[PDB]
Amino acid sequence: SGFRKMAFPSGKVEGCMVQVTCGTTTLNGLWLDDVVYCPRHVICTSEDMLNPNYEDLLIRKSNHNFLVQAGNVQLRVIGHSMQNCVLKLKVDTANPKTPKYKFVRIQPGQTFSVLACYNGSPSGVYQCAMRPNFTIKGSFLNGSCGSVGFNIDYDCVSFCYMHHMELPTGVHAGTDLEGNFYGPFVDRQTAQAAGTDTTITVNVLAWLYAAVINGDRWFLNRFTTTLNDFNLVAMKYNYEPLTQDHVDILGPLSAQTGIAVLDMCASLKELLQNGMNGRTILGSALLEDEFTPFDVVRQCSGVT
Amino acid sequence: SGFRKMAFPSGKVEGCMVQVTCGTTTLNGLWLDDVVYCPRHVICTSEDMLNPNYEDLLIRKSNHNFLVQAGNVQLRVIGHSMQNCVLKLKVDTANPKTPKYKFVRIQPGQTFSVLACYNGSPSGVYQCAMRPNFTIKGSFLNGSCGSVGFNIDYDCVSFCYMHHMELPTGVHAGTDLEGNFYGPFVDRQTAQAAGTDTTITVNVLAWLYAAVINGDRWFLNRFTTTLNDFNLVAMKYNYEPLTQDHVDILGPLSAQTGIAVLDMCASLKELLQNGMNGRTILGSALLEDEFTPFDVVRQCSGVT
Ligand SMILES: Cc1ccnc(C)c1NC(=O)Cc1cccc(Cl)c1
Ligand SMILES: Cc1ccnc(C)c1NC(=O)Cc1cccc(Cl)c1
Secondary structure, eight states: OOOOOOBOOOHHHHTTEEEEEETTEEEEEEEETTEEEEEGGGGOOTTGGGSOOHHHHHHTOOGGGEEEEETTEEEOEEEEEEETTEEEEEESSOOTTOOEEEEOOOOTTOEEEEEEEETTEEEEEEEEEOOTTSOBOOOOOTTOTTOEEEEEETTEEEEEEEEEEEOTTSOEEEEOTTSOBSSSOOSSSSOOOOOOOOBOHHHHHHHHHHHHHTTOOTTOOSOOOOHHHHHHHHHHTTBOOOOHHHHHHTHHHHHHHTOOHHHHHHHHHHHHHHOOTTOOBTTBSSOOOSOOHHHHHHHHHTOO | OOOOOOBOOOHHHHTTEEEEEETTEEEEEEEETTEEEEEGGGGOOTTGGGSOOHHHHHHTOOGGGEEEEETTEEEOEEEEEEETTEEEEEESSOOTTOOEEEEOOOOTTOEEEEEEEETTEEEEEEEEEOOTTSOBOOOOOTTOTTOEEEEEETTEEEEEEEEEEEOTTSOEEEEOTTSOBSSSOOSSSSOOOOOOOOBOHHHHHHHHHHHHHTTOOTTOOSOOOOHHHHHHHHHHTTBOOOOHHHHHHTHHHHHHHTOOHHHHHHHHHHHHHHOOTTOOBTTBSSOOOSOOHHHHHHHHHTOO
16 A cells, blocks of 8 residues: 555666766766767857757767766767767777666656766656656756656666756756657757646546555545546646547556546546645645556556 | 655665565565565464564574575575564675665654565665654555665665555554664554654755745745744644754755745745645645755755
8 A cells, every 4th residue: 555656766777877078068878788878968068058050069079079987987989979869979888787678759648767867876766757748847957967767667678768958947858769859849048938738637547546546535426427528627627638548548447446437537527626625635635647557557566 | 956756766775685485475685795684574474463473483484494586596594583573584695786785773754765676576666754653654565575765875875664564554664674663563463553643844844945946935925933933833733843953954955045944934834824725836735744954955956
């Protein structure tokens, strides 16, 4: 029993973190096999960041300008290339601590763990969701650039995020491991609009099922609804429209609890229209959307 | 910017986790140097747990009855001893992945990271506080026994908790690494009272300072209070009494923000008496007490 915002064990990712320095800028890199991946803005000075011409800036750099250090040992850079917003520094040594890994581009609403790093050293780990608007509400300071997000399936780490930037609004933007930004963002010191965000409906429902499994049941009611009626309420409260694909993914939790998905939707509808009346659910006074249906089943079944 | 319930990177602790089996019971052990530490109730059957005589049960066991497996390799047990509620199994091999470590008994109100494990395999990591009543509100299922809590200072892991039991109320009880329970709990299948819990006042104040640093300032007011007046409010709302020792530990955050500790106490007083009026602080609709003043300074300064 109990329900926590649990992160994946970060060990396999800690063994990949390195420090990358170019000129006067230092950030984090990810060392997998004989390649170090890092945000391409490591090649910028503060003056460059206003409107950088990355192609021109990278041409002034040679392999010996990229200083890569793994803990205390220096890596020898034998190649460099830019792929979208990431730099790939080929090194002469394969990382002996490289776990089994994949590069994945996650969908909005999916969750992942972030290993926050500074100067190539891990400081902490936390779980978060990629917002529907492709931002993440992380905890990152200057120097955290290059910190990565990931999921783990037994022995395989799927890297899904690399941190690049903090928007003027204090929310975070980054790329997949091929350097493609999530969202409309560009790696430039300019004010950039993050779209209207919404609450991840399927995750809130998954978390209400986790609440029932763990004993918090006060919000269950004698009502039911339809997908259409529920979506009228979801639109009014800036929630993502619920689809049959979302209902299908909630099936295991519906089966485990015996509460039909549309009955849980009716509980959520009443919570949206009436608030929590000063009560809590799983220690929260708001509707939590950072747990996917997969996360709930994993945490509630003890998958290692 | 941003503020998350961040856990320490779990890598150094993952390398210590082992599976311990005795008879038909399997749980987690902590392998440090040539000793494996685990909850002594690994020697019990379900029938024994009602009122176990651990001394008598342990006498029926020999070194060869304790099966210790580190991933896929079997450890050879050359000694066994009970210290309070933990068993110490001496093995013939020192753990090559033993980090620099200490065993510490933490105070109520302090925080730590938990690496939840099943069958000696890490499933997730989360941050939590030891409640004033010496329970923890974790996320643990059957088989999580032996999972540990810890803090990390640069390269040193201070182990402070080992999970033993879930109380009938769904909250968790465990020991320090010398096997001494935190709180009045006994390792027995009996209903056990956890005392009245309170909110960790100094942590809520630390978190209000983190909110100010990160831009959430709506709760700041034009008022101040005294320790005496604040403590009358704290008593009414089941908050721990604030002392000058607590004020002194909040000094760095008071200096960083320019908000005197008693002025922050007046904001907290108004939040206690008036609620949050449907607003949030750092993404929470309640007053958070799982961040110590040290945690706030660490997260806000990027200590690795
Ligand atoms: C200051 C800070 C705080 C938290 N995370 C981060 C990542 C930062 N740093 C930046 O955003 C620097 C920067 C400026 C403009 C564009 C880009 Cl790609 C990077
Ligand atoms: C079932 C469960 C769930 C979460 N954590 C845990 C630790 C459990 N298991 C138990 O509590 C088993 C047990 C019963 C009586 C005394 C003791 Cl020391 C241990």
